[PDB]
Design a protein around this ligand. Structure first.
Ligand SMILES: [Cl-]
Ligand SMILES: [Cl-]
Ligand SMILES: [Cl-]
Ligand SMILES: [Cl-]
Ligand SMILES: [Cl-]
Lengths: 7, 99, 99
């Protein structure tokens, strides 16, 4: 699955 | 513009006639915004972040202005901590990372 | 270099004598690396994002070489799904977002 990293 | 990174790279976006704040996020494949109403049908999508996976609503071909640049593309709606502009729309506005 | 965003902006880093691949992430305040040993004292931290929070170990004054540029700063270590170079080190290598 697609990855969304803000943090 | 040339945006340095000493502060979060927050910009104003416009979606559905309304202004919002969003983070320019090179670590994001996709654009994710907090709950709002968008037109048309949506499709399911699962996305992964630092803490695990969430379900979102995928809307395609949405008109969005990002720091005054026009984009038209996929917007995900779901329980994100902050509005995120990801690479799908960063490429539309011509953004690059430079060092 | 100028890095386009058609693909994830992955680079080689050296940290703790180890070569790793990491994501240049303008959406991350902090640098977060998968489990590894680092020298010195540490203290626990919680960091959050899509999917919620994870617990990490915070190490200060860690030197990293990022795509051939050396930087020093705090590095968080824990169960991140991907190694992240966040703004605290991106600033040190002079990285900017341009469009
Ligand atoms: Cl798109
Ligand atoms: Cl990729
Ligand atoms: Cl190790
Ligand atoms: Cl730091
Ligand atoms: Cl600077």
């Amino acid at each position: 699955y697609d990855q969304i990293x803000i943090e | 513009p040339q945006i340095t990174l000493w502060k979060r790279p927050l910009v104003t976006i416009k979606i559905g006639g309304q202004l919002k704040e969003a983070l320019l996020d090179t670590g994001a494949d996709d654009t994710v915004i907090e709950e709002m109403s968008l037109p048309g049908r949506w499709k399911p999508k699962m996305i992964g972040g630092i803490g695990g996976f969430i379900k979102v609503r995928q809307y395609d071909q949405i008109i969005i202005e990002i720091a005054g640049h026009k984009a038209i593309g996929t917007v995900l709606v779901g329980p994100t901590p902050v509005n995120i502009i990801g690479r799908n729309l960063l490429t539309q506005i011509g953004a690059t990372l430079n060092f």
